[PDB]
Symmetry: D2
Subunit: 414 residues, 4 copies
Amino acid sequence: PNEECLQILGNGAKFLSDAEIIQLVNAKHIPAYKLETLIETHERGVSIRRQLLSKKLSEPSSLQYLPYRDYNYSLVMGACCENVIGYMPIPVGVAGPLCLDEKEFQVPMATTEGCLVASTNRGCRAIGLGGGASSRVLADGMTRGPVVRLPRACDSAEVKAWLETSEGFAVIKEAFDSTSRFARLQKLHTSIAGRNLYIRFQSRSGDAMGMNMISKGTEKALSKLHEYFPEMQILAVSGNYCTDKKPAAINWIEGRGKSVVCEAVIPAKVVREVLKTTTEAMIEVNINKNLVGSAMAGSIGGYNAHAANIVTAIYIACGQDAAQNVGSSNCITLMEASGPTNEDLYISCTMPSIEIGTVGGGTNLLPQQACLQMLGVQGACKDNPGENARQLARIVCGTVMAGELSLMAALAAG
Amino acid sequence: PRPNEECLQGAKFLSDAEIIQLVNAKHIPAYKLETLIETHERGVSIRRQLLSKKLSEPSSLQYLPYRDYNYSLVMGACCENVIGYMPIPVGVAGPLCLDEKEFQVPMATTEGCLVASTNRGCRAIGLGGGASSRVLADGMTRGPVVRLPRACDSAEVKAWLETSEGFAVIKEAFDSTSRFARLQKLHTSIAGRNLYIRFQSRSGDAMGMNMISKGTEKALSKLHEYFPEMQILAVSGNYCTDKKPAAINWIEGRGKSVVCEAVIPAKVVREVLKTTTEAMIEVNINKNLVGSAMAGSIGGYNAHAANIVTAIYIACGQDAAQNVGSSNCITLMEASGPTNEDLYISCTMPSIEIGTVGGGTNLLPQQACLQMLGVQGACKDNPGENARQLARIVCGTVMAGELSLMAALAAGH
Amino acid sequence: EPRPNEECLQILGNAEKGAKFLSDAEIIQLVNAKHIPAYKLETLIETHERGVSIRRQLLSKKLSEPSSLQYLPYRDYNYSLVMGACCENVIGYMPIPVGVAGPLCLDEKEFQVPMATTEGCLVASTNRGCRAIGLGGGASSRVLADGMTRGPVVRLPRACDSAEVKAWLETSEGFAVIKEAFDSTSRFARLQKLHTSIAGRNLYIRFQSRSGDAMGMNMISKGTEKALSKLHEYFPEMQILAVSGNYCTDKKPAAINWIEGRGKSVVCEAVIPAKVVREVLKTTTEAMIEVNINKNLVGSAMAGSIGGYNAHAANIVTAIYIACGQDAAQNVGSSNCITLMEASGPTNEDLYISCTMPSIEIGTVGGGTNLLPQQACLQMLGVQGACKDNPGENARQLARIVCGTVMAGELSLMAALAAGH
Amino acid sequence: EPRPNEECLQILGNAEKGAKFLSDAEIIQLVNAKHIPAYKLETLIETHERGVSIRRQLLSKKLSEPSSLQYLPYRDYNYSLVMGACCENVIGYMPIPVGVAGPLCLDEKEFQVPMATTEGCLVASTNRGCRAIGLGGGASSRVLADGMTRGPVVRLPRACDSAEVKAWLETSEGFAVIKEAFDSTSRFARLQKLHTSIAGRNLYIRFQSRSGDAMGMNMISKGTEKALSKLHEYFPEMQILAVSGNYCTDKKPAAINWIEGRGKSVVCEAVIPAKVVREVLKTTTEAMIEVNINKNLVGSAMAGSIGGYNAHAANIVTAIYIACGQDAAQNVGSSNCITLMEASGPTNEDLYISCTMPSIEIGTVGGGTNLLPQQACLQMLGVQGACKDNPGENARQLARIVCGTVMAGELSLMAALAAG
Ligand SMILES: CC(C)n1c(CC[C@@H](O)C[C@@H](O)CC(=O)O)c(-c2ccc(F)cc2)c2c3ccccc3n(-c3ccccc3)c(=O)c21
Ligand SMILES: CC(C)n1c(CC[C@@H](O)C[C@@H](O)CC(=O)O)c(-c2ccc(F)cc2)c2c3ccccc3n(-c3ccccc3)c(=O)c21
Ligand SMILES: CC(C)n1c(CC[C@@H](O)C[C@@H](O)CC(=O)O)c(-c2ccc(F)cc2)c2c3ccccc3n(-c3ccccc3)c(=O)c21
Ligand SMILES: CC(C)n1c(CC[C@@H](O)C[C@@H](O)CC(=O)O)c(-c2ccc(F)cc2)c2c3ccccc3n(-c3ccccc3)c(=O)c21
């Protein structure tokens, strides 16, 4: 019906059928934007959106194998996704044990690339027979890099000098830190371009990746800066000086999120039996591929074989922002001869800009929390704020090193 | 639970608890179960149980799902050591009015506001007459490193590859490996006695990594016949460049190079995007050009192309790790129209690495999202037209995302 | 005794008298009253040198310290070849000390390399590198490419239109038409394959061509102008925004020069015996490779370098460029260099070295190479002027000498760093 | 007249006779017979000019064309300040034409800028830019930072050890000990915030400090030796692999100089009235902005440039550097510049321009600035030598003049490109 359908809606939506609510869209009665709140259950809302979508597609049977039933939409709606028509299953394999810092980890990897999980698993095996890997977090601080503008370059210079004094920095730090308990503003990084001023705010953010919290603190910091400099115009809360989800030398040099190093010595016996190559062959490929090769290609921060493969796979499994693989994959892989007879392989990976978290975003979803719980880093750390996210970053750097070892060995053997 | 003595006699008759009790007691090794178990879902079940005992929290796997998923197309193709699947929420933004067509773009993400933002950008484009796009180039690459005894020798190989006859014989060996293998002009760079050779070729509708790799191996084998002292050091010497940031991809292109554009009426910028044309151009210059410049960016002259690229890629069975290079984008904005109050926008993406056959596009859920766009599988009549169409949709959806986010930043919300 | 401005104007306005009759103070009177422009002083006055003397006196009164130009030399210099070609508003010349480093044993020949510098120990260091190369049986080098570029930016109404122009330039027929127009501007113009890049409705076109022994800036620009005019006949809606849209790229750092090359791309190499590494360079092969990997590769990588995978190629390039009449501002791109080092020989104790420099922008005709003093330095190397029998051979040879001298400088500085001196 | 070998040697040994008593042809005979090596021809000869003449004669016979040095000048140059300080194996000097562009109206002062070049139209073009700036009310500039750097590479046995050293350097007390050692080497030394980067067991340490009016290369390297020696005491397993590990970065392109700055970071600006853009520059403000955006921003972006967002800053930097006794090889990094242009004023017809140069490496004492001809060009600008009442003011002033002259050159060349 048409008129009777509106009456029952005013009382609920359960008494109206699927075909009746879809008829309210077609025959203009009530618009399409009112759909999330109106329907009772979340799963039925997804079903009605899929039927509406089906008639717009040139092949309505497209959605047949896109699944949607029995998924927990309660944590997704109004938090992680909009216009939800279902979910996308990504196969999850396991590579391990990764022997890292006197512990053993089973690393979940969501991917559809054949041989990737198997390769990473072989890398872990080589590391494990070689006495294990060790890693350190060198720095920690998510950033946001707004652009502001003053009437003149002489004015923007005045603002830069003011922020660089002990007093000016104290005023902006107090504003920034007041927005949340984990907001602790580190030293600012500023760059002038004429009358423009790019300001890089950096702060730890507990176990969150921290972009929402740092953005809150930045908005408050710029409002405080407005009081001391009324002619200043906030052009954008991000002027790409952060830098988020684009390649940027500033992330490579200053770091962003977690800066991490990892290392291991692979005994000569393990290089031959597990990796099917030699230490000499591995060093030759590493120098001429990951250093010289990347140099000839004009790379900034891409001094590695396939760090992005491991970063992406762990990120999708563990509820991270996979778009941040742009900067998070930044990595330099070094190799040299080691031990008394110089036949053992010393490997290290350095990743200055791993953008990561174990609370918020996709880490609030239960399947993603399962993969985080495998690693023992799910949620916030009560006793040591930021320790779970720090640990996950160490696991990412260590797993990348396992991937580097294995693929470089395949390339070396020919 | 029976003893392990009468368990030695195949798999279907035994129980799950029996197989795991033979792995720990060490009757059977740990690499026999992949082949012996018949039903693929039961293979994943046993793997999860063995995995559970290695974890400090064995119950961590409970909410990682695995039942009733189609593992037939995954095993021996897409993933190893499989313990389940990870559901990523899929939203839809559209219609995207692109080249006199309308697209409903699937986006797999867990970032709030992303799909709604892109949807708003699509609406502004549609009310402004739509967008137009063009594929400027097409060719996946692979960039091996070879070594000769001396720099004079590597120089000889470079000059030889640059003659018409030397290139012709290398092109012959390359193209023999596949129906779609058609080698384009080579790009070579010397570093002492090293020579980096950038093989480029179309690959039908595939992303083309496996095909170009096979062509490269046969091409280098032919080059070995003419230069027997040459050593193939690595089939990839990072000169491709695959899954790392590289200026060579930005300048020369990799996969599909694409451009897209649209004019948004001044009224549409005000009412839909809640800003002005003047404010949009101001932010684009000082964020996407000057800001990226101050940050030392190569190819990152955009707001958040990577967000859209990643969401479409995960939804459509692409290699998400290739978002590193595929997200390369320069967003440009200027005034347009008679009164100079309309907003011309353009996005240029020189290295979209993409495909509609092979890899994750073999799986049915991923094929469902590809089918929404009308690009699933190989185009029989025009090989590569589906992959090219998907690249255009990516670039157009990126432009929609740029429009919407830049408007949010420009109005200072 | 000085005279009125009007009386001096009637004498210089006359043909048979000239500035010879007038004094210094009287000519200064005419310039200050704007009857005679300052920049034309050479033309009006009887000699070039007196024109420079008058300009100096004009300038000295403007300065807070009138005796500032005392030790800036100017007398007895050949200003005839500078005027209307190399410099304007000339107030003298700047002496840069010139040292010699050699012999450099390169491609079975020997070179005495001139180096203009004020940096202590640079010439001596480079000289030590030459000595090490000479005792190791010399260096070999190859020119891998040759072609100066210009990278204009044009614009179409739409990106769909700029795309059409790109596709048209990539057809065999379209490239042929543009090639005919480019090559019609000079006998040395041979247009190579076009490299194009779109940015929306913008189109950046990279024209590349040999240029005889000239660096080729002017010749490539003239060919580019004619080529774009021909392109406009097929596409009347195209606007030539700028003849250089920074896509060349000239005198700015750019990955496109590193990857595609610009001017001459060159590679050079040598093997230094272990004995020579110990006795001349005061280090070992193992220590040299260790420093090269971690400084010139890893170190440059950590600093975010594109093209700067070397110790100090720019010191050598700059010193040779100033001495040999080159454009010293082009050291920005010409200094692009990757230095590689590894073990060699039967006991893995000898030191293989190589330098690869893809973008040496250089010439032996035109610009500063027209001046006699810098022609003297070119004549040392046997590369002065145009090679008639093999056009471009002299400029090619100079690029090889630059690359080989850089390698000598890399050897010597890296040895000093490896020893911890 | 040319005496036998042994008769010439006995006079040389006697220190109250020397090589003055002998002739030119006799000294050449002593070099070829291998009695006295060629490198030791500086000290033995009496006057510096004669020593250069003898080196030139020995060189001439080695060359395929013995008359090649004919037009390379050498006579009557003051070699006293050059020998053992600025150049070795000296065979003469190379005259670079010097032109003047000005007045440059900068910070309420007027400057006559010397420019050593052989590129036609460069000085005249720069001069036209200065004239446009002057008729527009002048330019204003600011020094935003000042600190020469050196970036050694050290190595610990493990990455965990290199991590420990990084953390130690980041504490207040660790940095204080290193700053005390660094600052002790010179009265102008003041070590700023230390900036480090790990690569496995490598640690790259970027030392930064002001250096008075010197470019500071020698000063910073000496302070860095002392700093690393002090760090050796707390970490004896550390190995100084190289005093420069290319992390400075000196004389190579590097994003670190672009982002962190090196030497003087400077900004300059001016507004050119619409009337002056039309008449002097022969173009419009609209055409200028359009060329600047699509050439200096979009164009440099398409070429994959880091720090090269300008038309020809390198031309001006190089011309001033050679004229003023600077290290011209440092033009690689000193040329780093971004040029921005906007519409300005009430009709939106005036042209606002700015140039930002984060890494001008420069000095007014030491190096080639010790030579008299180079000191004359520095004297033109009022920046010769060390400022006693404010150490670093002369070098800061020259940096501002460079940035201002670059902006003048940017204005003029961009106008010629815009006009077609
Ligand atoms: C990590 C894994 C997915 N993988 C990869 C990565 C491809 C991409 O994800 C990134 C890669 O392009 C990054 C790069 O190296 O530039 C290649 C690979 C690299 C460069 C090529 F040119 C072509 C293939 C290979 C590979 C190549 C030849 C022989 C064996 C190989 N095995 C393998 C198979 C079975 C047992 C043992 C080893 C791999 O697992 C493998
Ligand atoms: C695309 C979307 C996920 N989004 C984003 C992207 C954040 C990231 O994924 C990439 C971004 O960091 C890339 C960059 O700009 O550097 C920001 C954003 C950008 C820069 C910031 F500093 C902080 C937030 C914002 C945003 C910011 C302020 C006000 C509204 C906003 N809305 C919004 C909400 C409701 C209705 C209308 C608009 C967004 O949808 C949105
Ligand atoms: C080239 C020459 C002008 N030089 C230089 C300056 C290089 C610079 O122009 C570029 C350099 O900064 C590039 C780089 O390495 O980053 C240094 C030098 C380098 C880095 C430092 F930190 C401090 C000083 C050195 C040097 C240093 C220690 C011991 C010996 C040295 N010798 C030397 C002395 C006698 C016989 C043999 C060689 C030099 O000739 C020399
Ligand atoms: C600075 C000066 C030495 N100059 C230059 C330098 C080229 C180089 O030093 C840097 C340049 O390549 C950097 C770049 O723009 O990419 C060009 C120039 C630019 C791009 C070209 F394609 C070809 C020539 C021009 C120029 C070009 C066309 C018309 C007038 C010109 N005038 C001029 C003449 C008389 C009165 C007013 C101005 C110049 O002074 C001038």
